[PDB]
Amino acid sequence: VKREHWATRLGLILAMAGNAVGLGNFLRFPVQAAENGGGAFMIPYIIAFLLVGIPLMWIEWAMGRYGGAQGHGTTPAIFYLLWRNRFAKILGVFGLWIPLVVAIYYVYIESWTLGFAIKFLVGLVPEPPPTDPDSILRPFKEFLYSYIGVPKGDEPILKPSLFAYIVFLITMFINVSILIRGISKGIERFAKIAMPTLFILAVFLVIRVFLLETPNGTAADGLNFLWTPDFEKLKDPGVWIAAVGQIFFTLSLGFGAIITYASYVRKDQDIVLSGLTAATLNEKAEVILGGSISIPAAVAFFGVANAVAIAKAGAFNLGFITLPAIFSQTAGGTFLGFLWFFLLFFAGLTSSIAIMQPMIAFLEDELKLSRKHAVLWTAAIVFFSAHLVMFLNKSLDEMDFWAGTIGVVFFGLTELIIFFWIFGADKAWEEINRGGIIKVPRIYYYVMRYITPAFLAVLLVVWAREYIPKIMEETHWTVWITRFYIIGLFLFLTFLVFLAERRRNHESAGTL
Ligand SMILES: CN(C)CCCN1c2ccccc2CCc2ccc(Cl)cc21
Ligand SMILES: CN(C)CCCN1c2ccccc2CCc2ccc(Cl)cc21
Ligand SMILES: CCCCCCCCO[C@@H]1O[C@H](CO)[C@@H](O)[C@H](O)[C@H]1O
Ligand SMILES: CCCCCCCCO[C@@H]1O[C@H](CO)[C@@H](O)[C@H](O)[C@H]1O
Numbered sequence: 315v316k317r318e319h320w321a322t323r324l325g326l327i328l329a330m331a332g333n334a335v336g337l338g339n340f341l342r343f344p345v346q347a348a349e350n351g352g353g354a355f356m357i358p359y360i361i362a363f364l365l366v367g368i369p370l371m372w373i374e375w376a377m378g379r380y381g382g383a384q385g386h387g388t389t390p391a392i393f394y395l396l397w398r399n400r401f402a403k404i405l406g407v408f409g410l411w412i413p414l415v416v417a418i419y420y421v422y423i424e425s426w427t428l429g430f431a432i433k434f435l436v437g438l439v440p441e442p443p444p445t446d447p448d449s450i451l452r453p454f455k456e457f458l459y460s461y462i463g464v465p466k467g468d469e470p471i472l473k474p475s476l477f478a479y480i481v482f483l484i485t486m487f488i489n490v491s492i493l494i495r496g497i498s499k500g501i502e503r504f505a506k507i508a509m510p511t512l513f514i515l516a517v518f519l520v521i522r523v524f525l526l527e528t529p530n531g532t533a534a535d536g537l538n539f540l541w542t543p544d545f546e547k548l549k550d551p552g553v554w555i556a557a558v559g560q561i562f563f564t565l566s567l568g569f570g571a572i573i574t575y576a577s578y579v580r581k582d583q584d585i586v587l588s589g590l591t592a593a594t595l596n597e598k599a600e601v602i603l604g605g606s607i608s609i610p611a612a613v614a615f616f617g618v619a620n621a622v623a624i625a626k627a628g629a630f631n632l633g634f635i636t637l638p639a640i641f642s643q644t645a646g647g648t649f650l651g652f653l654w655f656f657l658l659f660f661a662g663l664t665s666s667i668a669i670m671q672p673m674i675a676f677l678e679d680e681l682k683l684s685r686k687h688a689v690l691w692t693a694a695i696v697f698f699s700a701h702l703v704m705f706l707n708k709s710l711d712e713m714d715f716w717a718g719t720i721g722v723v724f725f726g727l728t729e730l731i732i733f734f735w736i737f738g739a740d741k742a743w744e745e746i747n748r749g750g751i752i753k754v755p756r757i758y759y760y761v762m763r764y765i766t767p768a769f770l771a772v773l774l775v776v777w778a779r780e781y782i783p784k785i786m787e788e789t790h791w792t793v794w795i796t797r798f799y800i801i802g803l804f805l806f807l808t809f810l811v812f813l814a815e816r817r818r819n820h821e822s823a824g825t826l
């Protein structure tokens with residue numbers, strides 16, 4: 315062919331919206347917000363969306379469409395197209411490494427939601443007794459802990475239940491069944507089914523939650539806590555780092571995923587309005603839907619102070635333990651739990667296929683593998699690698715940090731510098747607006763060229779100076795097992811880019 319292309323504009327928008335709308339909206343956002351003072355988190359969040367989220371979204375859509383027009387959907391080649399320096403290809407490897415590493419733990423978490431959905435649907439759930447908080451949360455904590463196999467001793471090892479393992483296998487098979495059908499007949503087709511389902515399930519859950527009321531509060535108290543400003547924290551670096559990190563994660567920015575999806579957009583197609591729409595749809599799903607489910611429910615039943623303590627407790631407690639526990643105290647609560655996990659599963663699935671496609675696109679575009687082989691090998695690498703996340707306690711956290719937290723911010727800055735500084739601000743601006751149904755507001759030219767990069771640069775330095783040291787000095791030794799492995803993955807991916815180069819050289823000397 316030349317390239318596969320999104321069939322319809324609606325399919326394109328829903329596929330991109332599904333790329334973005336995932337576990338980050340319903341699980342990550344609530345914890346981050348509650349953990350950072352709720353309303354106090356929102357100001358930096360909104361600012362990050364305007365100064366970082368929106369501008370980078372347009373930039374990645376532009377880079378992808380630009381690359382696609384020349385038959386390239388991933389950063390190793392696209393970065394090179396924008397800056398013909400071998401170093402561009404190496405920096406580009408992060409556009410394959412980040413999504414791959416994130417997929418290695420993201421699909422596993424996604425599989426938990428399918429496993430929970432299954433168990434809640436058939437009623438194989440814990441039975442709490444008769445209004446102490448712990449006698450109520452404990453059965454659900456044990457339920458999660460037995461599912462993933464949390465360490466009961468001193469060894470930093472996890473023991474996933476057999477059901478969890480088999481469900482991960484099924485989950486991988488489901489991701490493959492969609493990806494193996496390609497862009498239009500696979501990802502786009504699925505998005506047209508999943509997004510509407512996702513929206514309906516989420517609205518229903520918000521409505522149900524809004525009816526919650528106990529001696530400790532109502533869902534309204536939850537919304538008040540999340541949407542009430544606290545200008546006295548606008549000066550804490552930590553809240554800003556959390557806010558910006560969430561924006562990157564929730565919009566799928568810096569993962570090379572938006573770029574790859576955009577590489578299937580026809581060269582002439584608009585990306586300004588489409589990009590803004592995908593981004594806007596994600597924010598609504600995040601702040602309106604995701605923000606209105608778990609926090610209001612937790613606050614209604616336990617009050618703000620306890621809700622916050624829950625979010626800070628961590629380990630998927632809010633979404634996999636607390637919410638289902640709360641639901642169990644209501645009529646039809648087990649089924650509500652099913653709907654919650656089913657919602658999470660579809661949110662995750664539409665996002666995981668998005669972070670596996672970069673590796674698939676690279677194998678197809680640069681190594682010329684058939685889609686079938688590219689999808690199967692990608693799945694094999696993710697499946698194999700995930701065993702590290704399934705059996706080594708904290709490996710998931712380590713990957714989520716280096717690739718999904720630090721990595722994306724670093725890559726976002728990198729792609730911006732390459733596209734807006736090296737490739738050329740005016741050429742980049744031109745490329746972004748080309749074919750647009752609407753033009754990017756002019757003030758954004760200055761935001762992209764000066765504000766965004768300066769913003770990310772400062773964030774990254776603050777990170778390396780007052781946070782990375784603790785992570786490098788105060789963690790259990792087992793973190794090095796994961797660091798070693800993912801560094802190895804980077805090395806391997808660089809080797810593949812080298813092979814792509816050599817294949818390119820040999821076909822050019824065969825093109826003459
Ligand atoms: C009414 N049916 C069209 C929906 C079931 C098909 N579907 C689907 C839809 C569009 C494009 C690819 C795929 C692949 C198979 C698959 C796998 C899992 C799920 Cl959760 C849905 C699903
Ligand atoms: C601290 N870890 C136990 C958890 C890290 C995983 N993670 C994550 C990663 C992918 C998808 C959903 C979620 C939900 C939980 C959550 C909450 C806050 C943060 Cl900042 C990360 C985070
Ligand atoms: C292909 C790479 C394989 C690495 C070793 C994988 C071992 C998986 O082993 C399986 O794990 C499940 C969940 O913990 C258990 O329920 C099964 O009984 C066990 O056989
Ligand atoms: C979606 C269907 C998943 C079926 C796998 C369920 C695994 C849950 O549990 C396992 O089931 C096995 C066979 O029933 C038993 O031999 C194991 O002892 C038991 O732990």
Ligand SMILES: CCCCCCCCO[C@@H]1O[C@H](CO)[C@@H](O)[C@H](O)[C@H]1O
Nearest residue numbers: 463472473474700701702703705706
């Ligand atoms: C870095 C990833 C390494 C994965 C190696 C997994 C080896 C699996 O090991 C197996 O796990 C089962 C369930 O936990 C146990 O029941 C078996 O006794 C054990 O041998």
Ligand SMILES: CCCCCCCCO[C@@H]1O[C@H](CO)[C@@H](O)[C@H](O)[C@H]1O
Nearest residue numbers: 471472701702703704705706707795
């Ligand atoms: C990241 C690696 C996680 C590994 C989890 C391993 C759980 C293994 O289980 C252990 O395997 C050993 C060797 O087979 C046996 O000698 C032990 O008796 C057994 O408990």
Ligand SMILES: CCCCCCCCO[C@@H]1O[C@H](CO)[C@@H](O)[C@H](O)[C@H]1O
Nearest residue numbers: 364365753754755756757758761765
């Ligand atoms: C920090 C980023 C803020 C983005 C808000 C942009 C609001 C758009 O602002 C509008 O842009 C148009 C096109 O440039 C101008 O013609 C209008 O006069 C201006 O009000």
Ligand SMILES: CC(C)C[C@H](N)C(=O)O
Nearest residue numbers: 334336337338564566665
């Ligand atoms: C890594 C990304 C695909 C994650 C997705 N944007 C989410 O919010 O879950």
Ligand code: NA
Nearest residue numbers: 334335336564
């Ligand atoms: Na999102």
Ligand code: NA
Nearest residue numbers: 332335664665
């Ligand atoms: Na999604």
